[PDB]
Design a protein around this ligand. Structure first.
Ligand SMILES: CC#Cc1cncc(-c2cc(Cl)c([C@]3(C)CC(=O)N(C)C(=N)N3)s2)c1
Length: 386
């Protein structure tokens, strides 16, 4: 229904991540924590770092418990190593509960903490299967549900500004909402449409059809989910499998053919700029991803605008952007640029993910993002990769 205490509790942006305030220890130590549906560990800076202005001080927490075990988590993004322990954790603009949770106290890291992000840790919201060192390390959300009456569901409204936010603006601006235990009806318009969670590890889904301005990409649907498709608040871009990326970029280029962009733009490396207020949104196509429905042989589609896939960046008074669709060798990743178009419901209890048009999606007077259905779709199980 209505969760006023949790609405507008996020800050950040697609390039740096969206974070929520949390407290760890007794007395409480306030930290800003990245909301990450693409991982399953609660890991916080616990030692001085040039890019951290605060960190978790275990020696100052009377409720700190040492698990006497280390963990090393290498990624292609940042690498981190930490010391496992437990402590009391709260979310000030969240449910009015305090839970005992696992915390990986980061003592060393490489390219993990980013200069100017304003976050000191990561809240991994995915399932125990992908927790490090192994699935015996109960994720935060699992602890929260076990220890309290909080329903086994959370929902995210990530709010892209539609323009660059400087260092001060990004600290003062509302970046969205994380509703823990419910669905807030003020955060979306129209209906919520649900897609099954294929398997409980990452938030895995199945894409059944892809269109660029209504034109079918016409690839075998298995290609769209090769080797998986996930919903990840911890990824900036919409990431597509190599072959899907090559077909999508060819189609987006054909649709926007009245303006030639350098190769660097399509590679997501170079920005493109237009005179203030003249961005030619109309020349770029809409993108629709059809997802498996809850009813047999039924699908629905989510449609994003270039206002979602063109990420605003500062150059001048020009309006500049980077292309926020990129290739992947690890499957489709529906990152922040996709999530900014929708209110996304992580219905863990009913093993499903809901999508509705976000009340904060950026658009123009001519087009809006959309969530529509149903469509009759056959052999959708065949779209899943094994
Ligand atoms: C939006 C946003 C963001 C954003 C900004 N800066 C750092 C990060 C992240 C750094 C690291 Cl490491 C992250 C991990 C744990 C591993 C990974 O590789 N992906 C992809 C994740 N889901 N989770 S997210 C995210």
């Amino acid at each position: 229904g209505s969760f006023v205490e949790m609405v507008d509790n996020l800050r950040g942006k697609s390039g740096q991540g969206y974070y929520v305030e949390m407290t760890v220890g007794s007395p409480p130590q306030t930290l800003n924590i990245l909301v990450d549906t693409g991982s399953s560990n609660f890991a916080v800076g616990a030692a001085p770092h040039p890019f951290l202005h605060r960190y978790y001080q275990r020696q100052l927490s009377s409720t700190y418990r040492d698990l006497r075990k280390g963990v090393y988590v290498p990624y292609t993004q940042g690498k981190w190593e930490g010391e496992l322990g437990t402590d009391l954790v709260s979310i000030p603009h969240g449910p009015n509960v305090t839970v005992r949770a696992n915390i990986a106290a980061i003592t060393e890291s490489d390219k993990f903490f980013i200069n100017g992000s304003n976050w000191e840790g990561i809240l991994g919201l995915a399932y125990a299967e992908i927790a490090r060192p192994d699935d015996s390390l109960e994720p935060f959300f699992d602890s929260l549900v076990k220890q309290t009456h909080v329903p086994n569901l959370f929902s995210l409204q990530l709010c892209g500004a539609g323009f660059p936010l400087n260092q001060s603006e990004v600290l003062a601006s509302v970046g969205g909402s994380m509703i823990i235990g419910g669905i807030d009806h003020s955060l979306y318009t129209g209906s919520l449409w649900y897609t099954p969670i294929r398997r409980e590890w990452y938030y895995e889904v199945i894409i059944v059809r892809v269109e660029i301005n209504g034109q079918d990409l016409k690839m075998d649907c298995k290609e769209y989910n090769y080797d998986k498709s996930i919903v990840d608040s911890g990824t900036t871009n919409l990431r597509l499998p190599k072959k899907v990326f090559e077909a999508a970029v060819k189609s987006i280029k054909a649709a926007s053919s009245t303006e030639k962009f350098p190769d660097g733009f399509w590679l997501g490396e170079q920005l493109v700029c237009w005179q203030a207020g003249t961005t030619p949104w109309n020349i770029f196509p809409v993108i629709s991803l059809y997802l498996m429905g809850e009813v047999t042989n039924q699908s629905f589609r989510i449609t994003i605008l270039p206002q979602q896939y063109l990420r605003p960046v500062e150059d001048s008074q020009d309006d500049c952007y980077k292309f926020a669709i990129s290739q992947s060798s690890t499957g489709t990743v529906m990152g922040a640029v996709i999530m900014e178009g929708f209110y996304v419901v992580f219905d863990r209890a009913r093993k499903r993910i809901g999508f509705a048009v976000s009340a904060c999606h950026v658009h123009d007077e001519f087009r809006t993002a959309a969530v529509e259905g149903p469509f009759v779709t056959l052999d959708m199980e065949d779209c899943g990769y094994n």
